[PDB]
Write a protein that binds this DNA or RNA. Structure first.
Ligand SMILES: [Mg+2]
Ligand SMILES: [Mg+2]
Ligand SMILES: [Mg+2]
Ligand SMILES: [Mg+2]
Ligand SMILES: [Mg+2]
Ligand SMILES: [Mg+2]
Ligand SMILES: [Mg+2]
Ligand SMILES: [Mg+2]
Ligand SMILES: [Mg+2]
Ligand SMILES: [Mg+2]
Ligand SMILES: [Mg+2]
Ligand SMILES: [Mg+2]
Ligand SMILES: [Mg+2]
Ligand SMILES: [Mg+2]
Ligand SMILES: [Mg+2]
Ligand SMILES: [Mg+2]
Ligand SMILES: [Mg+2]
Ligand SMILES: [Mg+2]
Ligand SMILES: [Mg+2]
Ligand SMILES: [Mg+2]
Ligand SMILES: [Mg+2]
Ligand SMILES: [Mg+2]
Ligand SMILES: [Mg+2]
Ligand SMILES: [Mg+2]
Ligand SMILES: [Mg+2]
Ligand SMILES: [Mg+2]
Ligand SMILES: [Mg+2]
Ligand SMILES: [Mg+2]
Ligand SMILES: [Mg+2]
Ligand SMILES: [Mg+2]
Ligand SMILES: [Mg+2]
Ligand SMILES: [Mg+2]
Ligand SMILES: [Mg+2]
Ligand SMILES: [Mg+2]
Ligand SMILES: [Mg+2]
Ligand SMILES: [Mg+2]
Ligand SMILES: [Mg+2]
Ligand SMILES: [Mg+2]
Ligand SMILES: [Mg+2]
Ligand SMILES: [Mg+2]
Ligand SMILES: [Mg+2]
Ligand SMILES: [Mg+2]
Ligand SMILES: [Mg+2]
Ligand SMILES: [Mg+2]
Ligand SMILES: [Mg+2]
Ligand SMILES: [Mg+2]
Ligand SMILES: [Mg+2]
Ligand SMILES: [Mg+2]
Ligand SMILES: [Mg+2]
Ligand SMILES: [Mg+2]
Ligand SMILES: [Mg+2]
Ligand SMILES: [Mg+2]
Ligand SMILES: [Mg+2]
Ligand SMILES: [Mg+2]
Ligand SMILES: [Mg+2]
Ligand SMILES: [Mg+2]
Ligand SMILES: [Mg+2]
Ligand SMILES: [Mg+2]
Ligand SMILES: [Mg+2]
Lengths: 56, 76, 136, 94
RNA sequence: UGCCUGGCGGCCGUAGCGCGGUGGUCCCACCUGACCCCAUGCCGAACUCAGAAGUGAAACGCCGUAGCGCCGAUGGUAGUGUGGGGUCUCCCCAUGCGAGAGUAGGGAACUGCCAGGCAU
RNA sequence: GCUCAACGGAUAAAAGGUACUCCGGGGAUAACAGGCUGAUACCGCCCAAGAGUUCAUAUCGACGGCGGUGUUUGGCACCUCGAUGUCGGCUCAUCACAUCCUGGGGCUGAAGUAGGUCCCAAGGGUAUGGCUGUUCGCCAUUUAAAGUGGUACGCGAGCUG
RNA sequence: UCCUCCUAAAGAGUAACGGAGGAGCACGAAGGUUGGCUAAUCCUGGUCGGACAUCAGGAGGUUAGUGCAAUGGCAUAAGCC
RNA sequence: GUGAAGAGGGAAACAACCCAGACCGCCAGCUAAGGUCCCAAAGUCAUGGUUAAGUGGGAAACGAUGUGGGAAGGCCCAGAC
């Protein structure tokens, strides 16, 4: 299974990386969330892959 | 002096892009020459506008012996 | 000197100065002097180096220039407020990107060619160094 | 008597080959005929003292890769436009 | 079934130009002849008709053909989203996407409804 | 039918002066001075054709190259318009050193004398008059010397107009 | 005020006292349709004919043309009878 | 994208730069950007090399037996200097 946490903030970053966190539901630093797996979820994590930590 | 004028263009190009579904009477490509040619079931107007005659999905098809862009209409 | 006998239109934009070279290797003769830095070469400097290197070759052998300036640089005249148009062309500049060659030489031997190219190197704004004829 | 000692690269492309360029090496390619393109690395300064003769570009070379002394000739070379270096060589299987 | 030849097609320079041979029983061109059928801004050159003495020379398809054009690798190139920098007038880093020109090569079309002739 | 052409077209119809001027505003927007680049100005460097009887380097340096200082002419309109008095003289200065004098050394195409030219050195000193409103300038005449600059081109709550 | 390319960052759009140009008409055919045809240029030969009139082939293949500026088109020609 | 309409630690101060989005209370713990010799909180922490110039703590053209590492060559007990 997967796991997602958000370690860097998102204020001074793009509106192409202020709407992926909508689709990941992350609203605060440390907001750990488990989701499904598919190629789409990896494609939606490799766009914001500088500010999450995957936990697996 | 010598360099004062310009004119805004008539907002040309492709309007209904290749792949999706259009009605009858709407316009695909408003263009200058015969840049995208007389494809299947489209009319080229007086100012060479590509307007469909039937309904359905559009498809950008290369054809011809001189490599010309034909813009097609088939029934969805 | 060198200058275009004809441009299609009068005044060109500035552009930018990115990229590596194209005329990289020696293409005609035996010896070459090649740029290293990034910059801009006017009409006067290359013919000044042509005289300063012909004076060391002493009408022997043959030399080739390949770069030819064609950029219509301009100036705004002094004590005119910044509006009211562009300016009139003052001189013609070439663009030199890092790696492009300027001159080639044959005939006269290499140890003379050291200082014979060093003199024309000393009148040029970007650092150059010597290269030889490469057999492929 | 001109020989070549080399091994085969792990990962290909730009960002790997730039570090392979930094680490005293440079890529090559060996193509031609029946055997597929072999994408190896070489030694940089140990062939700088070998490319200083025209017999590099006019004489046979024996490359020791995969326990197989391949018999090649020099085909084409690229160079850094403002450095005394070597970048990338072709080698035909002929 | 096999080969050749005739209108139409898929095809879009690997399908086109090169130079050397080719095949005329049938088909096709040349050709033959011309007043009404039509014809030329002069003219049987084009356009139309009537017919088959003669030729496959020019046209027209085939094989031979690397002088081309054309297709085309793998490998390397600067560009380049997004993020960190630097010696921030421009380049380096980790990540992908990574083409144009050139090297090794292919390469003298391929195929389909249709009609005739000769053979199997 | 309307070159309404200032072309969305205020009227069927329209030009100037105010140093005699007045009002509402404006540092959005000029002049004076700052601040920001540093194009022109000035002063050090680099290559060294030549000039210099011989000789690039005693002294100059062609065709070109790179910076410094902020110092003239300029560029931008930021502070400043419900106001910071502006050029030059008179009276008082202080620092800077790219040093005019004076102090010590090397080179010279330096015999001595007097000089050329950079290098160290800013402690101290630096003309009285004619002329125009004038800094400067020219001229007459001394001295070892009649330096170059910033300080709101110092200084009108200190003084002439 | 309107029109054409570029700056304009591979779709539309995007400015300045930025870089260059044209319009404020015409056409009773220069329009609709049918039928047919295909260029610029040089070589060679030829009555006066010359480097450039017209005539002959022949190379070459839109490098030409559009009633006018460019830009995009154009052989089925939208070019010419 | 901050900034105008935004507070706070690091850039000495410093609207725009990097970190980050504070509704109220507490004498509670972990870090970011950035810092750990004392001013002012945290390593005069360990191996490990360069530097000898306050370089660090402002800059070019060019200059040089300053210095450390790599790659080749020529001359040599046919003693090279
Ligand atoms: Mg370039
Ligand atoms: Mg990369
Ligand atoms: Mg033949
Ligand atoms: Mg033939
Ligand atoms: Mg005939
Ligand atoms: Mg490539
Ligand atoms: Mg390619
Ligand atoms: Mg072929
Ligand atoms: Mg053939
Ligand atoms: Mg108006
Ligand atoms: Mg209006
Ligand atoms: Mg009006
Ligand atoms: Mg009116
Ligand atoms: Mg009066
Ligand atoms: Mg009066
Ligand atoms: Mg008033
Ligand atoms: Mg006010
Ligand atoms: Mg203001
Ligand atoms: Mg002024
Ligand atoms: Mg001012
Ligand atoms: Mg000033
Ligand atoms: Mg400065
Ligand atoms: Mg000095
Ligand atoms: Mg002398
Ligand atoms: Mg001197
Ligand atoms: Mg002020
Ligand atoms: Mg006040
Ligand atoms: Mg005032
Ligand atoms: Mg001094
Ligand atoms: Mg002296
Ligand atoms: Mg003093
Ligand atoms: Mg003094
Ligand atoms: Mg004392
Ligand atoms: Mg007096
Ligand atoms: Mg008087
Ligand atoms: Mg005086
Ligand atoms: Mg002043
Ligand atoms: Mg001043
Ligand atoms: Mg003063
Ligand atoms: Mg004053
Ligand atoms: Mg006062
Ligand atoms: Mg006064
Ligand atoms: Mg008065
Ligand atoms: Mg666009
Ligand atoms: Mg017409
Ligand atoms: Mg003739
Ligand atoms: Mg027609
Ligand atoms: Mg915004
Ligand atoms: Mg406001
Ligand atoms: Mg704040
Ligand atoms: Mg703060
Ligand atoms: Mg600061
Ligand atoms: Mg503070
Ligand atoms: Mg909050
Ligand atoms: Mg940190
Ligand atoms: Mg402490
Ligand atoms: Mg320690
Ligand atoms: Mg330095
Ligand atoms: Mg000796």
């Amino acid at each position: 299974t997967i796991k997602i946490t958000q370690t860097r903030s998102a204020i001074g970053r793009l509106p192409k990386h202020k709407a992926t966190l909508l689709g990941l539901g992350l609203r605060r630093i440390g907001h750990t969330v488990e989701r499904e797996d598919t190629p789409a979820i990896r494609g939606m994590i490799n766009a914001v892959s500088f500010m999450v930590k995957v936990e697996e | 002096t010598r360099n004062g004028r310009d004119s805004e263009a008539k907002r040309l190009g492709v309007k209904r892009f290749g792949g999706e579904s259009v009605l009858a009477g709407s316009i695909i490509v408003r263009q200058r020459g015969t840049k995208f040619h007389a494809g299947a079931n489209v009319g080229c107007g007086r100012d060479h506008t590509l307007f469909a005659k039937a309904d359905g999905k559009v498809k950008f098809e290369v054809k011809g012996p001189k490599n010309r862009k034909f813009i097609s209409i088939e029934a969805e | 000197m060198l200058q275009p006998k004809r441009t299609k239109f009068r005044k060109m934009h500035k552009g930018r100065n990115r990229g590596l070279a194209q005329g990289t290797d020696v293409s005609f003769g035996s010896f070459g002097l090649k740029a290293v830095g990034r910059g801009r070469l006017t009409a006067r400097q290359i013919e000044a180096a042509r005289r300063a290197m012909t004076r060391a070759v002493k009408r022997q052998g043959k030399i080739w220039i390949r770069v030819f300036p064609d950029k219509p640089i301009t100036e705004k005249p002094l004590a005119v407020r910044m509006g009211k148009g562009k300016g009139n062309v003052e001189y013609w500049v070439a663009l030199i990107q890092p790696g492009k060659v300027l001159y080639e030489m044959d005939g006269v031997p290499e140890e003379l060619a050291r200082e014979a190219f060093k003199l024309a190197a000393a009148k040029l704004p970007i650092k150059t160094t010597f290269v030889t004829k490469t057999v492929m | 008597m001109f020989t070549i000692n080399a091994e085969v690269r792990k990962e290909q492309g730009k960002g790997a080959s730039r570090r392979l360029r930094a680490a005293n090496k440079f890529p090559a390619i060996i193509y031609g005929g029946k055997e597929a393109p072999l994408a190896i690395e070489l030694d940089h300064d140990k062939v700088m003292n070998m490319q200083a003769k025209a017999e590099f570009y006019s004489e046979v070379l024996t490359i020791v890769v995969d326990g197989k002394e391949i018999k090649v000739k020099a085909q084409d070379v690229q160079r850094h436009p403002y450095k005394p270096k070597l970048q990338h060589i072709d080698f035909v299987r002929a």
